[PDB]
Design a protein around this ligand. Structure first.
Ligand code: FMN
Ligand code: SF4
Ligand code: SF4
Ligand code: SF4
Ligand code: SF4
Ligand code: FES
Ligand code: FES
Ligand code: ZN
Lengths: 220, 108, 188, 436, 232
């Protein structure tokens, strides 16, 4: 794809998920789109980093692996295609010009409205040698939440792949042991998924109680 | 209560009927409870309050053996009645209105 | 077959059924034009003047809530026209000068289109150092409905509903000028 | 240019309003000429006449009449019948300064009656209405008497002069509302509703009175018709410019000796009119003036010799309006005059708009603070920005008319506005009271 | 309950008698049928009807609003909305003579403000109020299309041109004490009679209405200088 990545479609003015407190304002339809591919002249060293990545990777392989490049707020995010993640990770880590020796972790985020790409894993990579920073974004469907584990390339991803599996169910296949790290192994569900309820209890008060914030109204 | 991140405040408003007025304007806080077992002392409540009705004193001693006893109602939270103050159920100051109270033009 | 007309809002082209109002087209496209008197289910009235947008070939800003789409119209809202933004913000200012400082006690607080649209399309601080219009509040127009005329923006949505949708015009815009106010007849 | 008494011609006679006197001066001959012509022929005759709206819009009346959709020889089916056509004469004259309609109706109402009959025949309107403001009760009585005389004389009703044309003319006495003088507010008041302007489109030409095709014309515009039906088109075109031909009433009022109604060709400069009037009040000079009513931008001595026609006033940046020509001399405080006009507009706004309603309220308060000495340097910039936010944004032209005095007075007298900031109005009001 | 506007609000809300007696309603029904007969749409008669009832009483009352609503099949709310919109529909007991000093910019600064102040000090009555005698109701009116006739003053909508504070004081004294001075450019009659006239139920033939000096000024100048129309 080439259009910006719509993650949610909000209907109605005032950011109201429900029908609307006032009649007549619920007809606005605004898709919430995360930024799409950036025009080629990336700012700063991002342009050099992508030039080197496209040089080390073959043109065919580069096209197959890099789904998108997003330069947002002077930060570079390579939407990498799944499956190819280990290859590009190895290239980034090992290549002298890229040399992103320090992978800082793996963060899971869930986009239940993003069809075919509900689960995203974010790999913040830093190159101390060149003092550079990038992020890799890998998308997996909710129905097939598998992603190639970067354990061979970045051992630090262990306990980050485990944590993101625990909180989102992303199956980092190839991981030495993808067991729950935060939740009990007996736990049911993956808490940080949006569909997973907050699980709070009403706050008690003399003569009343306040339900958890997830049950009550909101205007996100 | 809106701004409290811990839902530690429960407030319910009621009309300031002329027969029984507790605050200037047409609304007052009839029921006001702070669940101090949920309060985190963040202070967002006092930042939120548009009337300076809610402040945070330097008093801190608080503890009890019962969960319920730490749900402090309006009676415990209200500041003590000082000299020159009358009982809340009374009409506004003569020749004054809500705007005068908020502008600070009211005296005992 | 429904006839599709096409037009550009801001700089994005879109095709909508003929007879569509500019505000509706903007809604479908995702542009949030501030509006008070507009209502999709009420016949447009163009009263509040909040929904003004710049349309090429027109000296005046046009109320998008009353403007029918045209097959080659070029429309630029406050997002892409300084004139439209200035007009909308001036209208919001004029809308707020007489408004009461009642948000803490107003029932509509937190769910008030005026609050949200003043945040999104209004100035940050007042210039109105003068005296505000005032009415006795709240007066009862029925056993169920209280009316606080000071907060009224005279959008006529209540009256327009009670006339068009429900054939019960027992409330109407009384008086004239700054004194205009929704009201029941005398006691009926 | 010289004065051209045409409508004013009969005045100074004994009882000029009577139908006898009107007939004594070719009265209703123009109506006979019209009825000898075809309706579309009458419309074309008026279009060639170049007559333009005298109510302030300045729109060509001939084209306005032509916009009415008559069945021009085409009868696709016998039903549904075409909606009735209505001719509404805007006898409302409430714009400040404008006092031309009322003297005309009071003295020679049969001019307007004949013009209305001719116009109704032109647009084939079976019913016509004279909407006259209620605050001119003498004019109401005169107009009702004239209509009754026309009915008795056979000029109204059915088969006018055996021509087969039928017309019933109703004199509607509107209540007090300046805004009702505006199209679609005149119609709303006629329909027994609040006199608030309608949303356009649809226009009155297709969705006017009772949601039927309608024509709204100022009494001056209509009354000028009989003078041109006789004397031909070329006679009318012989006066004024090519783009603004004809004669018009100018309501010299204010600090001018011998104020009154001067009937002169369009384009006569204010200098000539003042010379005819004897100039400004003796011992004083021209400080400012309104070419049209208060709705039009103020003008000063610099424009004293600009032709009083639509083109010239547009060139100066003002509008010809209703030829109110309000005059004010040194003794007047522009801030005071503009404050009173702003108070008038606030009192006259129907309230539908947010711009007009709220902005006029705010401007009235600001001007009250200026005159009282509570003003501030920021008040002038406010006034300007508020007027900008009113002008062009309001629903009808009343908002623009309210803004116009403020903007023009600021542009011409920012010095006086600043001077008011010291301690309020420095001018002594008594100096401007005509020594009353 | 206490529905609707509070009685003490600005621009006094419609108030007074709630209903008319049977005879009053019968006479009003006759007059209203006569009025409605002359319009293609019944509601078009609402403004005259409001005048008609405002003639029955001295001002608009809930009784009159109800009568008009019943006649035109409207709700009292619609009739009230129409009524409160127009200024001539006074909302308080109006004296036999409505003296309105035109205080618009022109007439104001040309004397009108002075006239109004003088009348307020002479009668004591503030604008919009009525004299204790109930004969004069002082008010300030916007431009009345008599600008050339400076400091114009209306008496039941009859012109009094070129007034001055002394002249206006004399006029109001005459109105209050009896014999009313004749209008400069009209024929004076009681407020109720003018209200009936506005409804169109009064004989139009009335005396007065002479052109006056200002209306003639242009024609007189044309005579003096021989200026005339170009002729065919
Ligand atoms: C606020 C306002 C008030 C008006 N008042 C009058 C009026 O009193 N008399 C009049 O003839 N036109 C008045 N007009 C102009 C009307 O729109 C009029 O119907 C239109 O200009 C056509 O006039 P015409 O016959 O000269 O072409 C007013 C316009 C506005 C915006
Ligand atoms: S300090 Fe106040 S705002 Fe913060 S959690 Fe406690 S009650 Fe809520
Ligand atoms: S209606 Fe007025 S007072 Fe109430 S929430 Fe909205 S802006 Fe605040
Ligand atoms: S009361 Fe009626 S006119 Fe006023 S804001 Fe509410 S809906 Fe609009
Ligand atoms: S601009 Fe003024 S007079 Fe015209 S519709 Fe708006 S509020 Fe009414
Ligand atoms: S919403 Fe369009 S003018 Fe009010
Ligand atoms: S200003 Fe008084 S009649 Fe016009
Ligand atoms: Zn001054």
């Amino acid at each position: 794809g080439d259009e910006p990545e719509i993650i949610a479609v909000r209907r109605g003015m005032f950011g109201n998920r429900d029908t609307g407190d006032t009649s007549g304002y619920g007809r606005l339809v605004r898709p919430v789109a995360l930024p799409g591919s950036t025009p080629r002249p990336y700012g700063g060293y991002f342009d050099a980093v992508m030039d080197r990545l496209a040089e080390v990777l073959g043109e065919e392989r580069y096209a197959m692996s890099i789904e998108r490049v997003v330069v947002y707020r002077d930060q570079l995010t390579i939407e990498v295609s799944r499956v190819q993640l280990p290859a590009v990770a190895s290239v980034l880590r090992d290549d002298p010009d890229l040399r992103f020796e320090l992978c800082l972790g793996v963060s899971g985020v869930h986009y239940p409205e993003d069809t075919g790409r509900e689960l995203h894993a974010v790999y913040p990579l830093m190159s101390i040698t060149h003092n550079r920073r990038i992020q890799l974004e890998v998308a997996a469907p909710d129905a097939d939440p598998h992603i190639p584990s970067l354990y061979a390339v970045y051992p630090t991803t262990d306990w980050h792949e485990r944590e993101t599996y625990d909180f989102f169910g992303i199956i980092f296949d190839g991981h030495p042991s993808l067991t729950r790290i935060e939740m009990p192994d007996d736990w049911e569900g993956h808490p940080q998924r949006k569909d997973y309820p907050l699980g709070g209890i009403p706050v008690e008060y003399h003569g009343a109680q306040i339900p958890p914030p997830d049950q009550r109204r909101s205007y996100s | 209560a809106w701004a409290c991140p811990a839902d530690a405040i429960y407030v319910e408003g009621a009309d300031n009927t002329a027969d029984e007025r507790y605050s200037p304007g047409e609304r007052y806080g009839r029921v006001y409870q702070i669940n101090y077992l949920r309060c985190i002392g963040c202070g967002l409540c006092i930042e939120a309050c548009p009337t300076r009705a809610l402040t945070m004193t330097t008093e801190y001693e608080m503890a009890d053996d019962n969960r319920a006893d730490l749900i402090w109602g309006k009676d415990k939270l209200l500041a003590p009645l000082q000299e020159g103050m009358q009982a809340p159920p009374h009409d506004m100051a003569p020749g004054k209105t809500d705007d005068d109270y908020y502008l600070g033009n009211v005296t005992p | 077959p429904v006839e599709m007309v096409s037009l550009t809002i801001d700089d994005h082209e879109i095709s909508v059924p003929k007879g569509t109002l500019l505000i509706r087209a903007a809604e479908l496209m995702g542009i949030q034009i501030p509006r008070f008197c507009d209502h999709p289910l009420l016949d447009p009235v163009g009263a509040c003047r909040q929904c003004l947008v710049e349309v090429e070939g027109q000296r005046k800003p046009m109320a998008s809530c009353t403007t029918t789409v045209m097959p080659d119209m070029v429309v630029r809202t406050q997002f892409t026209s300084e004139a439209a933004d200035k007009a909308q913000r001036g209208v919001m200012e004029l809308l707020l000068i007489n408004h009461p400082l009642d948000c803490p006690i107003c029932d509509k607080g937190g769910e008030c289109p005026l609050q949200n649209q003043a945040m999104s399309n209004g100035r940050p601080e007042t210039r109105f150092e003068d005296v505000k219009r005032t009415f006795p509040k709240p007066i009862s127009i029925s056993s169920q409905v209280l009316l606080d005329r000071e907060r009224c923006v005279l959008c006529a949505r209540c009256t327009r509903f009670s006339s068009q949708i429900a054939g019960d015009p027992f409330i109407d815009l009384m008086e004239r000028g700054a004194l205009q106010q929704v009201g029941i007849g005398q006691d009926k | 240019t010289p004065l051209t008494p045409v409508l004013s011609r009969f005045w100074d006679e004994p009882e000029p309003w009577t139908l006898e006197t009107y007939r004594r001066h070719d009265g209703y001959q123009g109506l006979q000429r019209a009825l000898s012509m075809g309706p579309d022929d009458v419309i074309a005759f008026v279009k060639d006449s170049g007559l333009r709206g005298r109510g302030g819009a300045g729109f060509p009346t001939g084209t306005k009449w032509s916009f009415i959709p008559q069945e021009r020889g085409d009868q696709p089916a016998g039903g549904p019948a075409a909606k009735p056509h209505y001719l509404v004469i805007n006898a409302d004259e409430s714009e400040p300064g404008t006092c031309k309609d009322i003297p005309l109706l009071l003295t020679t109402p049969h001019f307007l009656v004949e013009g209305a009959i001719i116009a109704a025949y032109a647009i084939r309107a079976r019913h016509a209405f004279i909407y006259v403001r209620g605050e001119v009760l003498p004019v109401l009585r005169r107009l009702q008497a004239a209509v009754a005389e026309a009915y008795a004389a056979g000029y109204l009703g059915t088969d006018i002069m055996g021509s087969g044309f039928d017309l019933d003319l109703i004199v509607h006495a509107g209540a007090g509302a300046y805004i009702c003088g505006e199209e679609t507010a005149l119609l709303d008041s006629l329909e027994g509703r609040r006199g608030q302007p309608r949303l356009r489109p649809p226009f009155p030409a297709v969705a006017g009175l009772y949601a039927c095709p309608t024509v709204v014309n100022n009494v001056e515009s209509i009354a000028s018709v009989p003078p041109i039906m006789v004397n031909g088109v070329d006679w009318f075109r012989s006066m004024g410019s090519e783009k603004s031909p004809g004669f018009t009433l100018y309501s010299l009022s204010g600090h001018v000796t011998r104020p009154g109604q001067y009937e002169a060709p369009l384009g006569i400069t204010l200098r000539e009119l003042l010379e005819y009037a004897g100039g400004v009040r003796a011992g004083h000079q021209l400080k400012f003036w309104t070419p049209g009513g208060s709705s039009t931008p103020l003008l000063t001595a610099e424009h004293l010799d600009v032709p009083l026609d639509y083109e010239g006033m547009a060139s100066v940046g003002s509008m010809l309006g209703t030829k109110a020509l309000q005059i004010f001399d040194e003794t007047t405080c522009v801030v005071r005059a503009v404050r009173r006009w702003t108070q008038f507009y606030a009192h006259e706004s129907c309230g539908k708009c947010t711009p007009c309603r709220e902005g006029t309220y705010w401007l009235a308060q600001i001007y009250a603070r200026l005159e009282n000495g509570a003003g501030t340097e920021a008040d002038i910039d406010k006034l300007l920005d508020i007027s900008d936010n009113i002008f062009g944004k309001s629903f009808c032209a009343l908002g623009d008319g309210a803004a116009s005095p403020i903007m023009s007075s600021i542009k011409h007298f920012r010095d006086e506005y600043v001077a008011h900031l010291d301690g309020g109005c420095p001018f002594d009001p008594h100096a401007s009271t005509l020594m009353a | 309950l206490e529905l609707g506007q509070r009685p003490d609000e600005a621009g006094p809300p419609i108030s007074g008698p709630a209903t008319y007696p049977d005879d009053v309603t019968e006479s009003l029904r006759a007059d209203a049928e006569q009025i409605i007969a002359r319009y293609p749409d019944a509601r078009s008669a609402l403004l005259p009807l409001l005048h008609l009832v405002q003639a029955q009483d001295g001002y608009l009352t809930p009784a009159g609003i109800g009568f008009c609503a019943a006649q035109l099949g409207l709700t009292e709310a619609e009739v009230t909305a129409v009524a409160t919109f127009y200024s001539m529909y006074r909302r308080t007991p109006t004296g036999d003579y409505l003296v309105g000093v035109c205080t618009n910019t022109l007439c104001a600064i040309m004397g009108g403000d002075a006239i109004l102040e003088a009348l307020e000090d002479h009668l004591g009555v503030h604008p919009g109020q009525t004299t204790p005698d109930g004969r004069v109701t002082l008010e300030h009116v916007e431009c009345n299309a008599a600008c050339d006739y400076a400091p114009v003053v209306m008496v039941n909508w009859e012109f009094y041109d070129n007034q001055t504070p002394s002249s206006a004081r004399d006029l109001v004294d005459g109105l209050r004490s009896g014999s009313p001075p004749p209008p400069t450019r009209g024929s004076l009659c009681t407020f109720r009679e003018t209200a009936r006239t506005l409804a169109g139920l009064t004989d139009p033939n009335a005396p007065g209405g002479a052109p006056g000096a200002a209306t003639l000024a242009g024609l007189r100048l044309a005579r003096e200088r021989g200026m005339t129309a170009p002729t065919p």
